[PDB]
Enzyme design. Sequence first.
Site, PDB file in Angstrom:
ATOM      1  N   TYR A   1      -3.631  -1.395   9.972  1.00 23.05           N
ATOM      2  CA  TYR A   1      -3.379  -1.667   8.568  1.00 23.05           C
ATOM      3  C   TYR A   1      -1.976  -1.225   8.171  1.00 23.05           C
ATOM      4  O   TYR A   1      -1.254  -1.968   7.496  1.00 23.05           O
ATOM      5  CB  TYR A   1      -4.439  -0.970   7.723  1.00 23.05           C
ATOM      6  CG  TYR A   1      -4.310  -1.152   6.223  1.00 23.05           C
ATOM      7  CD1 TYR A   1      -4.884  -2.241   5.583  1.00 23.05           C
ATOM      8  CD2 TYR A   1      -3.646  -0.216   5.448  1.00 23.05           C
ATOM      9  CE1 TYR A   1      -4.784  -2.400   4.208  1.00 23.05           C
ATOM     10  CE2 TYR A   1      -3.544  -0.351   4.079  1.00 23.05           C
ATOM     11  CZ  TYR A   1      -4.111  -1.448   3.460  1.00 23.05           C
ATOM     12  OH  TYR A   1      -4.010  -1.580   2.094  1.00 23.05           O
TER      13      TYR A   1
ATOM     14  N   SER B   1       0.831  -1.205   0.000  1.00 19.81           N
ATOM     15  CA  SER B   1       0.000   0.000   0.000  1.00 19.81           C
ATOM     16  C   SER B   1       0.863   1.252   0.000  1.00 19.81           C
ATOM     17  O   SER B   1       1.949   1.259   0.599  1.00 19.81           O
ATOM     18  CB  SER B   1      -0.928   0.047   1.222  1.00 19.81           C
ATOM     19  OG  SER B   1      -1.380   1.374   1.455  1.00 19.81           O
TER      20      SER B   1
ATOM     21  N   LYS C   1       1.123  -3.638   6.522  1.00 17.76           N
ATOM     22  CA  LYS C   1       1.713  -3.468   5.201  1.00 17.76           C
ATOM     23  C   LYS C   1       3.205  -3.169   5.290  1.00 17.76           C
ATOM     24  O   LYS C   1       3.977  -3.619   4.435  1.00 17.76           O
ATOM     25  CB  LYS C   1       0.984  -2.359   4.441  1.00 17.76           C
ATOM     26  CG  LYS C   1      -0.492  -2.637   4.179  1.00 17.76           C
ATOM     27  CD  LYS C   1      -0.673  -4.039   3.583  1.00 17.76           C
ATOM     28  CE  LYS C   1      -1.972  -4.130   2.802  1.00 17.76           C
ATOM     29  NZ  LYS C   1      -2.047  -5.350   1.979  1.00 17.76           N
TER      30      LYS C   1
HETATM   31  N1  LIG Z   1      -9.005  -0.892  -2.636  1.00 14.68           N
HETATM   32  C1  LIG Z   1      -8.018   0.158  -2.258  1.00 14.68           C
HETATM   33  O1  LIG Z   1      -8.331   1.307  -2.291  1.00 14.68           O
HETATM   34  C2  LIG Z   1      -6.570  -0.260  -1.806  1.00 14.68           C
HETATM   35  C3  LIG Z   1      -5.586   0.676  -1.560  1.00 14.68           C
HETATM   36  C4  LIG Z   1      -4.330   0.264  -1.155  1.00 14.68           C
HETATM   37  C5  LIG Z   1      -4.056  -1.110  -1.004  1.00 14.68           C
HETATM   38  N2  LIG Z   1      -5.047  -2.038  -1.235  1.00 14.68           N
HETATM   39  C6  LIG Z   1      -4.773  -3.522  -1.071  1.00 14.68           C
HETATM   40  O2  LIG Z   1      -5.087  -4.167  -2.133  1.00 14.68           O
HETATM   41  C7  LIG Z   1      -5.465  -5.682  -1.681  1.00 14.68           C
HETATM   42  C8  LIG Z   1      -6.744  -6.147  -2.392  1.00 14.68           C
HETATM   43  O3  LIG Z   1      -7.898  -5.459  -1.927  1.00 14.68           O
HETATM   44  P1  LIG Z   1      -8.951  -4.765  -2.988  1.00 14.68           P
HETATM   45  O4  LIG Z   1      -8.715  -3.236  -3.077  1.00 14.68           O
HETATM   46  O5  LIG Z   1      -8.756  -5.385  -4.353  1.00 14.68           O
HETATM   47  O6  LIG Z   1     -10.553  -5.004  -2.432  1.00 14.68           O
HETATM   48  P2  LIG Z   1     -11.380  -6.435  -2.320  1.00 14.68           P
HETATM   49  O7  LIG Z   1     -11.845  -6.632  -0.892  1.00 14.68           O
HETATM   50  O8  LIG Z   1     -12.572  -6.400  -3.242  1.00 14.68           O
HETATM   51  O9  LIG Z   1     -10.374  -7.710  -2.744  1.00 14.68           O
HETATM   52  C9  LIG Z   1      -9.676  -8.373  -1.683  1.00 14.68           C
HETATM   53  C10 LIG Z   1     -10.110  -9.875  -1.564  1.00 14.68           C
HETATM   54  O10 LIG Z   1      -9.432 -10.488  -0.230  1.00 14.68           O
HETATM   55  C11 LIG Z   1     -10.253 -11.447   0.140  1.00 14.68           C
HETATM   56  N3  LIG Z   1     -10.099 -11.802   1.557  1.00 14.68           N
HETATM   57  C12 LIG Z   1     -10.357 -11.294   2.765  1.00 14.68           C
HETATM   58  N4  LIG Z   1      -9.941 -12.223   3.664  1.00 14.68           N
HETATM   59  C13 LIG Z   1      -9.441 -13.292   2.981  1.00 14.68           C
HETATM   60  C14 LIG Z   1      -8.893 -14.512   3.410  1.00 14.68           C
HETATM   61  N5  LIG Z   1      -8.806 -14.750   4.723  1.00 14.68           N
HETATM   62  N6  LIG Z   1      -8.465 -15.409   2.516  1.00 14.68           N
HETATM   63  C15 LIG Z   1      -8.563 -15.147   1.155  1.00 14.68           C
HETATM   64  N7  LIG Z   1      -9.095 -13.974   0.730  1.00 14.68           N
HETATM   65  C16 LIG Z   1      -9.534 -13.043   1.661  1.00 14.68           C
HETATM   66  C17 LIG Z   1     -11.638 -10.871  -0.159  1.00 14.68           C
HETATM   67  O11 LIG Z   1     -12.548 -11.873  -0.359  1.00 14.68           O
HETATM   68  C18 LIG Z   1     -11.407 -10.016  -1.453  1.00 14.68           C
HETATM   69  O12 LIG Z   1     -11.994 -10.686  -2.679  1.00 14.68           O
HETATM   70  C19 LIG Z   1      -5.578  -5.696  -0.354  1.00 14.68           C
HETATM   71  O13 LIG Z   1      -4.416  -6.468   0.313  1.00 14.68           O
HETATM   72  C20 LIG Z   1      -5.596  -4.244   0.069  1.00 14.68           C
HETATM   73  O14 LIG Z   1      -5.010  -4.104   1.315  1.00 14.68           O
HETATM   74  C21 LIG Z   1      -6.303  -1.617  -1.643  1.00 14.68           C
END
Ligand SMILES: NC(=O)c1ccc[n+]([C@@H]2O[C@H](COP(=O)([O-])OP(=O)(O)OC[C@H]3O[C@@H](n4cnc5c(N)ncnc54)[C@H](O)[C@@H]3O)[C@@H](O)[C@H]2O)c1
Lengths: 259, 259, 258, 259
Positions: free
Chosen positions: A152, A139, A156
């Site tokens: 969080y 992140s 990270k």
């Molecule tokens: N969406 C943002 O704005 C943003 C910004 C910075 C970093 N991130 C990072 O990007 C990554 C993906 O998140 P996203 O933004 O695509 O949203 P998202 O929640 O739609 O996708 C993340 C997926 O992780 C899965 N999850 C939760 N617990 C789990 C587990 N125990 N086992 C397997 N899967 C599990 C969820 O089912 C989900 O499909 C994350 O690690 C998040 O921290 C996201």
Amino acid sequence: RRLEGKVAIVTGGASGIGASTVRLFHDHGAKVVIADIQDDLGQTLADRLGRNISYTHCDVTDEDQVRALVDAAVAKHGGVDIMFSNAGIVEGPNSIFDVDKDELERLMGINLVGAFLAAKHAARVMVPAKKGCIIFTASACTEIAGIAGHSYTASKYGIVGLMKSLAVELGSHGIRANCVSPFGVLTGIVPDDEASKLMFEGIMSKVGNLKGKILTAEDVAVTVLYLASEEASYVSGVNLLVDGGYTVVNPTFINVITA
Amino acid sequence: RRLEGKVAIVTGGASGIGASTVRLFHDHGAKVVIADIQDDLGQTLADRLGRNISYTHCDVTDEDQVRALVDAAVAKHGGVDIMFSNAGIVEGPNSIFDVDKDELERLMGINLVGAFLAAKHAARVMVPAKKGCIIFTASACTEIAGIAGHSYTASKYGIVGLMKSLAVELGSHGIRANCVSPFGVLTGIVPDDEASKLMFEGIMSKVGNLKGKILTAEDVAVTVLYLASEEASYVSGVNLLVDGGYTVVNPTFINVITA
Amino acid sequence: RRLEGKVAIVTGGASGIGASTVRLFHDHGAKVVIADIQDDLGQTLADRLGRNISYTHCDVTDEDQVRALVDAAVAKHGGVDIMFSNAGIVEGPNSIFDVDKDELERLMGINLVGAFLAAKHAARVMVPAKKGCIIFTASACTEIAGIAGHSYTASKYGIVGLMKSLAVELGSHGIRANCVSPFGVLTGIVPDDEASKLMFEGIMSKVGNLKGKILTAEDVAVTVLYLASEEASYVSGVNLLVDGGYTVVNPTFINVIT
Amino acid sequence: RRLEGKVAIVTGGASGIGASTVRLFHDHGAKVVIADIQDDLGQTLADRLGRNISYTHCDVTDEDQVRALVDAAVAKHGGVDIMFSNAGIVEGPNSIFDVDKDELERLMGINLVGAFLAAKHAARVMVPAKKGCIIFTASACTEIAGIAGHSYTASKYGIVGLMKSLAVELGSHGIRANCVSPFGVLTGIVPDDEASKLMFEGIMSKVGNLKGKILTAEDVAVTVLYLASEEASYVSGVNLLVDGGYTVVNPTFINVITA
Ligand SMILES: NC(=O)c1ccc[n+]([C@@H]2O[C@H](COP(=O)([O-])OP(=O)(O)OC[C@H]3O[C@@H](n4cnc5c(N)ncnc54)[C@H](O)[C@@H]3O)[C@@H](O)[C@H]2O)c1
Ligand SMILES: NC(=O)c1ccc[n+]([C@@H]2O[C@H](COP(=O)([O-])OP(=O)(O)OC[C@H]3O[C@@H](n4cnc5c(N)ncnc54)[C@H](O)[C@@H]3O)[C@@H](O)[C@H]2O)c1
Ligand SMILES: NC(=O)c1ccc[n+]([C@@H]2O[C@H](COP(=O)([O-])OP(=O)(O)OC[C@H]3O[C@@H](n4cnc5c(N)ncnc54)[C@H](O)[C@@H]3O)[C@@H](O)[C@H]2O)c1
Ligand SMILES: NC(=O)c1ccc[n+]([C@@H]2O[C@H](COP(=O)([O-])OP(=O)(O)OC[C@H]3O[C@@H](n4cnc5c(N)ncnc54)[C@H](O)[C@@H]3O)[C@@H](O)[C@H]2O)c1
Ligand SMILES: C[C@H](O)COCC(COC[C@@H](C)O)(COC[C@@H](C)O)COC[C@@H](C)O
Ligand SMILES: C[C@H](O)COCC(COC[C@@H](C)O)(COC[C@@H](C)O)COC[C@@H](C)O
Ligand SMILES: [Cl-]
């Protein structure tokens, strides 16, 4: 084309950045195992994209499910070239007083322990092959405060440290490990169609340092594709920010003297 | 394909990473102006590659030549999408007792003042276009000591700082600025394998952190292509290390306890 | 009294952060050579502080003056324990369109070439001693954009890179090298001008991350004192931010959502 | 005299760096509460150091014990000026295959969750006071690989990230937060036996980048004293390496070419 014959696993692959990467990997000739716990969305995606894309239920906090997911992937496709450890849960900026010890341990389990286990068992089958690629979703909060919650943020940072240790240890076996660190992408929630999408992409348009472009999950997937392909064949140990320069500026001083 | 219709200027374009990038940009449909002071090498390359590639003499320490080079590029092609500020001279590890003031100032003029001029005059013609991309060749010495000379190291740190303040200022106009920091690159020898490639592997196989792979000028051209393409359209302010993880480890401790 | 018997050279020592450090070094028993081009301000400070404090004119862009300055310090006091390479000129935030090639080179000569020359000639006399300490004044702009000009920013990054290669090369001889990277410093008017101090707090109370405290040249001098003292005897290679956390935050997102 | 009347809590205060900081704090006029789980070592030290130094048993993984420890200190001394969150267990460099999911969670609880709890409850009594100082013991492994185990490394990165977001949140209340990141110190890590003291001194002299000095727990304590005093009253958000420059160099290339 760029991932023809490569085998990739994507945890958290059923939604968001993971889903975009699964779709992008598919378009580049990869065989992808979608790993998630939203079985209905994940299986739909695998069925929707065809024969190279399978769905496997895996809660990344359970080492046995992770172990099996990797053993299943080698059994099905003969090996794993790319492990995209992307599963995690998100926290916006908060206070240290908002940190509940149980919710801290819960988030650490998903975000950080899950990354450890995904890496451990990917390495298990990549090291004998003397090749492979581990990419973590970190992140932009790993390089600037003010855009994510305390629990969080710590999780990270921990991933960045794990990524760097693995880049050294697995370097001896020809395996690369890197992070992608995006700056807020539209994902999750109830897609309050116009209301949530217009409000997000209006905020991010004022928050971002790079104007005239909104970061989408598809943008992040393309950077993962770069890190996962042979075009990054000497890139290892890198936490690659996709943030339009947000983390390199504190504009307070310039804002204050001119307003 | 990936740079169709884009116009790029490449300083230090007649040899090495610059020449490799010029060739790769040509392969991706870009119009390229080679900017250098090796008129024979530079003109030969431009002629071989055809209509879209031209050669312009430009000493990057001469602001009149740098301004003329960018103004001629706009006159010829209508604008500049990519400025790859790559010209510089190199120093291996040395001692502070070896730093000669005139050689320090000469290297600063080429390496660091030249980067200011290329960025200043690219920014001048990119800002009206509300798009564009400035990429500097830095070096892995910007993130670890022990692989470059004192004068050289300070000049490449200076480039990183310029890039970060450019990413902030030019972000308001939709313009990106990034660095590529490569490690050990084989140049100067005629590639497609050689005696010169294998034995260079002999050095790097003991030096590198990532085993079983050597960085070539063509690998660096590929990372610049990523940074310069729309696949990096939200990447800015980034100093991208291409070093196989060399800069994230000091193995002295592990070496001593396992002797 | 933490620098008892130590010999220090301070470039840019006639005013500002340099003068504050010169005075603090004097208070801790150091012998100090003030090196500057503000001969009147510099001689006055040296005269006022007594026998242990001298003044040497030294334009840090002139290597002959830099070599002469260090050799004079060895000839006078027997060696140099601390080199505080502090001379430089400052630029607030500006545009790349404002960068004049002649002023870029002029600033590079003073800020970065001067840092090389001071360090080269300090290293020359510290290596035989198997002890010593080179401290550069860098700037918080080395870790965040938006608080300094383009030319200035590049020169201070160059200092950080130079500092790190020096920490490696000179580490083998027991010699340390570090940077201090201060944020918004008052400097300007040292004498108790309350009007100027409270007004400076009016700006900084909105700009700074750490509220209820303003950074002064004397605070920077104290952090230099730490780096130059035996309390930092194993600190080397460090670019030490003195910025109240300004460089670790971009508050734009929180500002917009609140 | 430098901490006259200040109230300090030091977790892991019964041994090693923590104990060294306790004695140095005592010598500078501080009121110190030693917090640990080694009751016999800690109570002995508090008795010998006198009236200003007491001992409180506190396992840093139990939020109620941390809560009570901070409340007891406030009840006794009227407030807390300095929280030195120092408790932790160490891992030398190891392999990802050596990472056991249970041991990872055990180390995370002490190193990272414990830091969270100590900081939270220090912030609780410091924010009303509009003054205060939180210092974490991180590690030099936060700035290069090769000197600590995977689980340990990820936990200390997490501490750095936590420190950065506290410096921002707590900055609005006049409270500072920093890390000290030491290199290899002879403490309760390797036994009091003198056959291990001649060996530890010999390895560290070969490994260190700065020659002619061995890092001791007292050297770290002095750096904590600087960070905790008014001499660092505008220092916040800093991860201060105490490592002799070990983390800024990879000497492999220089070693091989002069071998
Ligand atoms: N969406 C943002 O704005 C943003 C910004 C910075 C970093 N991130 C990072 O990007 C990554 C993906 O998140 P996203 O933004 O695509 O949203 P998202 O929640 O739609 O996708 C993340 C997926 O992780 C899965 N999850 C939760 N617990 C789990 C587990 N125990 N086992 C397997 N899967 C599990 C969820 O089912 C989900 O499909 C994350 O690690 C998040 O921290 C996201
Ligand atoms: N060779 C390596 O291993 C290595 C390692 C780290 C960084 N780099 C960087 O890579 C960059 C590209 O160089 P390269 O390694 O591909 O080989 P190279 O030196 O042959 O190409 C660089 C070109 O810069 C040009 N140059 C010097 N002064 C110039 C001027 N005043 N005006 C225009 N051009 C000028 C040279 O003519 C040269 O063709 C350089 O900035 C170098 O510092 C190289
Ligand atoms: N003032 C701030 O807020 C601030 C912020 C960040 C960094 N800094 C750094 O602090 C350093 C010291 O400057 P200052 O802020 O205390 O203001 P200052 O004017 O009081 O000190 C600058 C000194 O450099 C000397 N100088 C200029 N050219 C010289 C030369 N050729 N030879 C010898 N000395 C020369 C000047 O005479 C002066 O004594 C500078 O490197 C500056 O960049 C200051
Ligand atoms: N000694 C080194 O070389 C070195 C290097 C880098 C970092 N560190 C860090 O220094 C910190 C202090 O440890 P140390 O090196 O002085 O060794 P140490 O074992 O002598 O001191 C650490 C103390 O933490 C205590 N501890 C363990 N679990 C605890 C708990 N649950 N609650 C409260 N206290 C607990 C231990 O009893 C011990 O007294 C550690 O966080 C360690 O990670 C040490
Ligand atoms: C609702 C959510 O937005 C609350 O978090 C804001 C908060 C503001 O602090 C940042 C500022 C730079 O000092 C703390 O909350 C303050 C109370 C009054 O709402 C976030 O603080 C944590 C940093 C690290 O982002
Ligand atoms: C601490 C140790 O790692 C530094 O070695 C000193 C050094 C060795 O170079 C010798 C070789 C012939 O090039 C390089 O200095 C460290 C810099 C890289 O930061 C000194 O170099 C002496 C000759 C090259 O003039
Ligand atoms: Cl940053």
